[PDB]
Coordinates of C-alpha atoms and ligand atoms in Angstrom, one line a residue:
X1 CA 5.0 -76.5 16.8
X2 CA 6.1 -78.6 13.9
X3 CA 5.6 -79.1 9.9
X4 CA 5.6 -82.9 10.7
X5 CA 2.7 -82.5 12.9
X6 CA 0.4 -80.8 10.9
X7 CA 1.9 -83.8 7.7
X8 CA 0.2 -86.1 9.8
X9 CA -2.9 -84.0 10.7
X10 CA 6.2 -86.1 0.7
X11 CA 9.6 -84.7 0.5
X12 CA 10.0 -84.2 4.5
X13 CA 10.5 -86.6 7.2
X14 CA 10.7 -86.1 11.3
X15 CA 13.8 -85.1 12.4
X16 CA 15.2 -87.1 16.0
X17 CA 16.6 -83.9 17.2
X18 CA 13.5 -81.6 19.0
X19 CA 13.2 -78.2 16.5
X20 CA 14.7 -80.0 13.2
X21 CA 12.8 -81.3 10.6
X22 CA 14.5 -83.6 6.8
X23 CA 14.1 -82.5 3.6
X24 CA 15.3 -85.2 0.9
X25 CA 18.8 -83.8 -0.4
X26 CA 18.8 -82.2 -4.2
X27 CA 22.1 -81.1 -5.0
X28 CA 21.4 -77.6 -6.1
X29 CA 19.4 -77.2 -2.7
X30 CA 22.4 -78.8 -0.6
X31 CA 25.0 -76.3 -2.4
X32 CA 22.6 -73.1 -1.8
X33 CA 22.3 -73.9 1.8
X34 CA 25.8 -74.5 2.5
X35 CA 26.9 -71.1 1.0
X36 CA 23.8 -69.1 2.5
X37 CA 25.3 -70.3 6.2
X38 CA 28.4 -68.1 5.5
X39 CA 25.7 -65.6 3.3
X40 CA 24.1 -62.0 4.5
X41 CA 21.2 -64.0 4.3
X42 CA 21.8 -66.6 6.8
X43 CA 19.0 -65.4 9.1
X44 CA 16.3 -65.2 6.4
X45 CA 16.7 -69.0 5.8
X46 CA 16.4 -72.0 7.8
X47 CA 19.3 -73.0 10.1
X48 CA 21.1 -75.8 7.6
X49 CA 22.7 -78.5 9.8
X50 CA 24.3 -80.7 7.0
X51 CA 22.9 -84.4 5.6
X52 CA 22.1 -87.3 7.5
X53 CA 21.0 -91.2 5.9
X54 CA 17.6 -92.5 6.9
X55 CA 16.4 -95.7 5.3
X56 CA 19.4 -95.6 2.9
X57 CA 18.3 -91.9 1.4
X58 CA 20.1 -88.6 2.2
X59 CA 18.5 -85.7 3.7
X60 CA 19.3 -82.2 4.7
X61 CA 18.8 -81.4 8.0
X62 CA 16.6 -78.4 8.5
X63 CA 15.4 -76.0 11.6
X64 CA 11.4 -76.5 11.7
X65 CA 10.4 -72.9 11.1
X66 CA 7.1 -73.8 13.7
X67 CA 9.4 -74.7 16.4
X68 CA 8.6 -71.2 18.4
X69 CA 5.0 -71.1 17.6
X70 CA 1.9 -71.9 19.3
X71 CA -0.5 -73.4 16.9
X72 CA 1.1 -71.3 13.4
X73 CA -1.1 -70.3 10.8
X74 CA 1.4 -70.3 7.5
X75 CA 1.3 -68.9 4.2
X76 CA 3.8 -69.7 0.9
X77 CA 4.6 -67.9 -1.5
X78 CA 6.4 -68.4 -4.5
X79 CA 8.4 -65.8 -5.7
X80 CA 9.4 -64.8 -9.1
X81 CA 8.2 -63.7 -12.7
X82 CA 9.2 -67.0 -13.9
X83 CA 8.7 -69.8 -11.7
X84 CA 11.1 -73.0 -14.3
X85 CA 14.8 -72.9 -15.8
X86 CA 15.4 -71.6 -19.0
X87 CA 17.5 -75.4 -19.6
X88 CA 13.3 -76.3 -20.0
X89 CA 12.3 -74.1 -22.7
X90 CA 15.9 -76.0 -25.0
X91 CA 14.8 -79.4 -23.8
X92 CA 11.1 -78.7 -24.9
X93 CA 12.3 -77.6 -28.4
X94 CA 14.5 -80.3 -28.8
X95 CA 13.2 -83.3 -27.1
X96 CA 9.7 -82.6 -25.3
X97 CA 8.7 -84.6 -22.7
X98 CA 4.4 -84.2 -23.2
X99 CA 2.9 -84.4 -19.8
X100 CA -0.8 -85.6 -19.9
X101 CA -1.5 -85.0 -16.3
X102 CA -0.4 -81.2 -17.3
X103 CA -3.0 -80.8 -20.2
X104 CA -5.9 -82.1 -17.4
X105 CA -4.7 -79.8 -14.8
X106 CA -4.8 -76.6 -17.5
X107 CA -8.2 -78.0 -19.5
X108 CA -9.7 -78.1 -16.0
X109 CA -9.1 -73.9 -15.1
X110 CA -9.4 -72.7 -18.6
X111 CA -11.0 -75.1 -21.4
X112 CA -10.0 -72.4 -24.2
X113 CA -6.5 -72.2 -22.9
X114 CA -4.9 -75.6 -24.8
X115 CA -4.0 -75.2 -28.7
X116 CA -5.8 -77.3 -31.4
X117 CA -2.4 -79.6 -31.2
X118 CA -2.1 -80.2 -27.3
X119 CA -5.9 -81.0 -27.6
X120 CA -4.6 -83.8 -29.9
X121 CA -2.2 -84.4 -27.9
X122 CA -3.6 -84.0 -24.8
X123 CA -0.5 -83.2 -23.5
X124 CA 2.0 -80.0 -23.1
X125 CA 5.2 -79.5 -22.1
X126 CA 6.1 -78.2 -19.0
X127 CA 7.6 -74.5 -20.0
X128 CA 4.4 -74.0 -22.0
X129 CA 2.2 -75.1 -18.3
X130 CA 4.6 -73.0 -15.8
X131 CA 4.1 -70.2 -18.3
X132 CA 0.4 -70.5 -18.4
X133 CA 0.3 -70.8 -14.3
X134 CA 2.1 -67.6 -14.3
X135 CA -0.3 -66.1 -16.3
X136 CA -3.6 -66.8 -15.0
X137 CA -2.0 -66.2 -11.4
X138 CA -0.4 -62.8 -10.1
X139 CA 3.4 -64.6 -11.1
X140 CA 3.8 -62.6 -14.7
X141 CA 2.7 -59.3 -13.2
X142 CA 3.6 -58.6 -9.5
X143 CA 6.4 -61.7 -9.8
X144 CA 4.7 -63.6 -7.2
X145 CA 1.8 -66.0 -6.0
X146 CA 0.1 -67.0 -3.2
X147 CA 0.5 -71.3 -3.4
X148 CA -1.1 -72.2 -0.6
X149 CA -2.2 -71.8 3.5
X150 CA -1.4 -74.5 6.4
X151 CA -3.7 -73.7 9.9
X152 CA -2.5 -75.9 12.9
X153 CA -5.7 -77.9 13.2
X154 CA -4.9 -78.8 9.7
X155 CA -7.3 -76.6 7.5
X156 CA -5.2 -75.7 4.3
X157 CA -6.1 -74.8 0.9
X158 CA -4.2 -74.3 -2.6
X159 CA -7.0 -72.6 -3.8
X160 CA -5.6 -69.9 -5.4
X161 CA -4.6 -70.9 -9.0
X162 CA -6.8 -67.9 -10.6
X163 CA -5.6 -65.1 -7.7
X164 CA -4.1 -62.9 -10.0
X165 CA -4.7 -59.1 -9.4
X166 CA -3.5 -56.5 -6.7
X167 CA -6.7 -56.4 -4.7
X168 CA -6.8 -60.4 -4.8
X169 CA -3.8 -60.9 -3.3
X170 CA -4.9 -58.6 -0.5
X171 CA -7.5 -60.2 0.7
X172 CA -5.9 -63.7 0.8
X173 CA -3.3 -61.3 3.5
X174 CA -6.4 -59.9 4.7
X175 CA -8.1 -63.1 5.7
X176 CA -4.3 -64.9 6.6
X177 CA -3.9 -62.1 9.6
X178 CA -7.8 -61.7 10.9
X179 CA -6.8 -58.0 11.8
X180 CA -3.5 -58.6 13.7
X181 CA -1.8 -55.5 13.3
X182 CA 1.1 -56.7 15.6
X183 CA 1.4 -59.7 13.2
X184 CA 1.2 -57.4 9.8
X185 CA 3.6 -54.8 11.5
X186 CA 6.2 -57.6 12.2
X187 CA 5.5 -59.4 8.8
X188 CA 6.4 -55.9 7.2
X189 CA 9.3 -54.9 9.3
X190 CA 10.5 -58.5 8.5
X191 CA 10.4 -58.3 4.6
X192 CA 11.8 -54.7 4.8
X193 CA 14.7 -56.3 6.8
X194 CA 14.8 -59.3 4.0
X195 CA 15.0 -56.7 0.9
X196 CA 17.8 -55.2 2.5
X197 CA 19.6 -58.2 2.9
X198 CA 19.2 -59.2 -0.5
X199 CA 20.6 -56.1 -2.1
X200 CA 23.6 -56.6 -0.6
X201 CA 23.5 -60.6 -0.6
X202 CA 26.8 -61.7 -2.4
X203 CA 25.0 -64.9 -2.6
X204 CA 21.7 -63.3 -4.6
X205 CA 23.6 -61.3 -7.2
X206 CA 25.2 -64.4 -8.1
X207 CA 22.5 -66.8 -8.2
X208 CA 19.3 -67.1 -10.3
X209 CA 16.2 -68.1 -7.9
X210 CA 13.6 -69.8 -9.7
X211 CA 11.2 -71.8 -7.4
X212 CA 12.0 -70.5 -4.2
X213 CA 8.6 -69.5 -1.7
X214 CA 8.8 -66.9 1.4
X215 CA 7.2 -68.7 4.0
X216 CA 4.9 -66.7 6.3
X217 CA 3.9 -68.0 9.9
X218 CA 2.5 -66.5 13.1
X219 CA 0.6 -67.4 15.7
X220 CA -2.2 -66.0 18.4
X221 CA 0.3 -64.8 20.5
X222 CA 1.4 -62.1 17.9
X223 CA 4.4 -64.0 16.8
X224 CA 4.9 -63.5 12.8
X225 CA 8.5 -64.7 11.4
X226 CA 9.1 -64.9 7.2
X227 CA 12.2 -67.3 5.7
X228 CA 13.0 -67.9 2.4
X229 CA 12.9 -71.8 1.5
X230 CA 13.5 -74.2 -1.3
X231 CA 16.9 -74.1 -3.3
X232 CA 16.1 -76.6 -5.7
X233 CA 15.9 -74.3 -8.7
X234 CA 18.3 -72.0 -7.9
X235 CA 22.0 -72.3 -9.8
X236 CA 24.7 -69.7 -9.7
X237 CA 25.5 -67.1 -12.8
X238 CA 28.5 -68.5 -15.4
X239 CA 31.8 -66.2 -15.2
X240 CA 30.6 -63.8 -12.5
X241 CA 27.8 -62.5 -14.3
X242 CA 25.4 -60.2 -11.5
X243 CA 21.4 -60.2 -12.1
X244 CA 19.3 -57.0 -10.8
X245 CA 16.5 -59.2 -10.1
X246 CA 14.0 -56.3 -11.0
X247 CA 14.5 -56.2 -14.8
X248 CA 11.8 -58.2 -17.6
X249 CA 12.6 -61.2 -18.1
X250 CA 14.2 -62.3 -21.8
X251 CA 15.5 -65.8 -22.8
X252 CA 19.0 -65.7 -22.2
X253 CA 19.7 -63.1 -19.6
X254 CA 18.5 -65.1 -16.7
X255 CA 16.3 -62.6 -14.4
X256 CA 13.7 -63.6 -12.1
X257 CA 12.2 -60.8 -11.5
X258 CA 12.6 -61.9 -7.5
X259 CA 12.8 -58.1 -6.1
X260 CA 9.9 -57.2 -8.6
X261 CA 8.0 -59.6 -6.6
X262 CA 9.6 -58.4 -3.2
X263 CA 8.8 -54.5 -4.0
X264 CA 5.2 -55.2 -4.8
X265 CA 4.6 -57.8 -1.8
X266 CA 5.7 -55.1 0.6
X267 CA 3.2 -52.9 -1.3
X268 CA 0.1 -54.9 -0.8
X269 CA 1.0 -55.5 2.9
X270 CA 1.2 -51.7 3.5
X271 CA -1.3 -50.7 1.7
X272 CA -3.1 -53.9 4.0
X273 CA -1.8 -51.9 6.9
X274 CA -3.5 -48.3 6.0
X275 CA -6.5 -50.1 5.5
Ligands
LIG301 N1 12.4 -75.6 7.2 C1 11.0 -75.7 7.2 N2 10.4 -75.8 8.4 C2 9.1 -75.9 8.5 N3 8.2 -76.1 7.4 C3 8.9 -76.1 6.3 C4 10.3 -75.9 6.1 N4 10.6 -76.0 4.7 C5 9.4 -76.2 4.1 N5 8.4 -76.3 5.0 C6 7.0 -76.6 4.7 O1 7.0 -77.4 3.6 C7 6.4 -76.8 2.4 C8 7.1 -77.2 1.1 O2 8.4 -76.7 1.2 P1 9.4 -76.7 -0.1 O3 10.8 -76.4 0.3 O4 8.9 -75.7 -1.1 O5 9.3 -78.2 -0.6 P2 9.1 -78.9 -2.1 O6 9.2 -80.3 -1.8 O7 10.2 -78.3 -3.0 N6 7.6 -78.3 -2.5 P3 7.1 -77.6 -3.9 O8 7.9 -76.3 -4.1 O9 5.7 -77.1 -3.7 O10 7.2 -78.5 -5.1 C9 6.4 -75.3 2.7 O11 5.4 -74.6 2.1 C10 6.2 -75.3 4.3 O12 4.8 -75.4 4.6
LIG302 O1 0.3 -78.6 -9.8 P1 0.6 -77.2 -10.1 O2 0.9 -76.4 -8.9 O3 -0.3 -76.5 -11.0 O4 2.1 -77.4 -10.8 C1 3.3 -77.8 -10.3 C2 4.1 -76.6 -9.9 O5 3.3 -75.8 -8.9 C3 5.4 -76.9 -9.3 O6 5.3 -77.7 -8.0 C4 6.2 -77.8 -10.2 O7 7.4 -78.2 -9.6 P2 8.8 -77.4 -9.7 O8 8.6 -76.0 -9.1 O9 9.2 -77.3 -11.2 O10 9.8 -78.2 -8.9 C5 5.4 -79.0 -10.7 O11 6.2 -79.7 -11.6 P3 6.5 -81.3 -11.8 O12 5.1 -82.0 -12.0 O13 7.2 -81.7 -10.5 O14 7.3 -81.4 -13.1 C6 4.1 -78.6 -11.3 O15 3.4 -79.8 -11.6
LIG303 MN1 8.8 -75.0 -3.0
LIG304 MN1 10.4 -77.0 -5.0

């Protein structure tokens, strides 16, 4: 139905319009959406309406990707080999910001995993946390995650912090679908359709996507739709410089690793499919 309704069952707000939902404005986010309207990708994203003021704050106005569905079940996932901006890893060697609430969060999964100095600390910086969360989850070697699930009634979980390897990750999708092989079919055919459009995407080859999820959603009635979302983290290439989106990662060269991600997503789901 709506994202609001299951909010109620903080970056989004209730749109006035019926199928629309707010998103606070970010400038990066406003830019990608504007230029992903006139994109190949324009169906693989929400609708993008412009920006309206409510209680003196900007916000983008979005289609609510529940709208057609009857009670959605969702799943996000966030997409890349490297899920923070390289401008991080410079302001953490020149000025680090320690985050306390950072060093809990990581002492908490892996006790071991903090150095003798961020003990001291008890603090890291954020680079040195995004990296660890990438390791520890399936992000560093199939260049994606599973964040979190959403049911209707309002049942969700994020527990999925240590879901690292192939077979994992399969039966998070395993459980997500309950044997719906209408709903896997159309999830695959969707994502085959979505790869397609980004190797041609003028829009992707120029851009670096760091932080963006595919959001998953069906219903009982067999309904299954997949959009990329979030275009906070995701800034275009100096001088018309092209990424491949597939290649390793290396300070200065600015890949992703989004397709990496894409190409081994669309594994597990057929390989879910034979099963
Ligand atoms: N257009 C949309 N329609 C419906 N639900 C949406 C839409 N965009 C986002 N959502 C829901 O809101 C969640 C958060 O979206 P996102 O764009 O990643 O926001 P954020 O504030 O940047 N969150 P995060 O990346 O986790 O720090 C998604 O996982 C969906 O459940
Ligand atoms: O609590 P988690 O999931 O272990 O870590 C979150 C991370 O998932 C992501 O939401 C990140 O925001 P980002 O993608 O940079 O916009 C947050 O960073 P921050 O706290 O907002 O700096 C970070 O904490
Ligand atoms: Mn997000
Ligand atoms: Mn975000």
């Amino acid at each position: 139905g709506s994202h609001m309704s299951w909010v109620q069952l903080g970056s989004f707000k209730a749109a006035g319009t019926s199928g629309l939902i707010l998103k606070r404005c970010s400038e990066p986010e406003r830019y990608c959406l504007a230029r992903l309207m006139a994109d190949a990708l324009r169906g693989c994203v929400p609708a993008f309406h412009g920006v309206v003021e409510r209680d003196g704050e900007s916000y983008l106005q979005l289609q609510d990707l529940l709208d057609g569905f009857d009670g959605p079940c969702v799943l996000d996932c966030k997409m890349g080999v490297r899920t923070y901006l390289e401008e991080e890893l410079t302001k953490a060697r020149e000025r680090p910001k320690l985050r306390k609430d950072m060093y809990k969060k990581m002492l908490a999964v892996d006790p071991e995993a903090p150095t003798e100095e961020e003990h001291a600390q008890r603090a890291v910086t954020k680079p040195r946390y995004m990296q660890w969360r990438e390791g520890i989850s399936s992000s560093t070697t199939l260049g994606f995650r599973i964040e979190g699930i959403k049911k209707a009634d309002g049942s969700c979980s994020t527990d999925f912090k240590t879901t690292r390897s192939r077979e994992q990750v399969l039966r998070v999708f395993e459980e997500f679908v309950q044997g719906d092989e209408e709903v896997l079919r159309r999830y695959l055919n969707r994502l085959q359709q979505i790869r397609d459009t980004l190797e041609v995407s003028e829009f992707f080859r120029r851009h670096e996507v760091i932080g963006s999820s595919l959001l998953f959603v069906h219903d009982h009635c067999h309904r299954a739709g997949v959009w990329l979302i979030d275009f906070g983290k995701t800034t275009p290439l100096p001088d018309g410089q092209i990424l491949d989106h597939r290649r390793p990662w290396e300070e200065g060269n600015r890949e992703d690793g989004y397709l990496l991600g894409l190409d081994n997503l669309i594994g597990i789901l057929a390989s879910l499919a034979e099963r």
